[PDB]
Amino acid sequence: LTTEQINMTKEQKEAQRAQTSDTRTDGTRVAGSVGKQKELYDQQITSYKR
Amino acid sequence: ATKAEYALTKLKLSNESVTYCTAQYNLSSMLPQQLLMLKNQTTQVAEQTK
């Protein structure tokens, strides 16, 4: 169980890393759930301007 | 009274034999299992450090 929780804590850490920086630790883009929220925010800004 | 002390010493023999048997069982079958438990505990300590 302790080894499994070791594995889970890294995922929690990266999921909370996504709140400040775009890149995800090793150097990949955030691409799930959060990425769609950021895309929605960009689209909302453009729609406001239009 | 000296007649009775003889029987007391014989019963003490009878108890001494069981003391020997219990010590032998403890040496042969209980200690290695405790050693295995301690070996299992050290690795758990390492996992907690991780």
| Cβ–Cβ under 8 Å, residues B39 and B33 | no
What 3-state class would DSSP assign to A28? strand
How far is Cα B15 from Cα B8, in angstroms, rounded to an integer?
11
Give the span between the Cα atoms of A3 and A22, in whole angstroms: 28
Burial of A34 (0-12, 13-18, 19+ CB in 10 A): middle
CA distances (Å), origin B11, targets A47, B15, B21: 102, 6, 16
CB atoms within 10 A of CB B3: 6
CA distance A18 to chain B (A): 23
Give the Å distances, CA to CA, from A7 to A29, A32, B13, B15.
21, 19, 61, 57
Residues 6 or more apart whose Cβ sits within 8 Å of residue A34? A18
**C-beta atoms surrounding A25 within 10 Å:** 11
Q: Which residues of B4-39 are buried (b: 16+ CB within 10 A; e: fewer)?
A: eeeeeeeeeeeeeeeeeeeeeeeeeeeeeeeeeeee
The residue length of chain A stands at: 50
CA distance A47 to B12: 100
Greatest Cα pair distance in chain A: 54
Say if the Cβ atoms of B44 and A2 lie within 8 Å: yes
- Which residue of chain A comes nearest to B50, CA vs CA? A6
Specify the experimental method.
cryo-EM
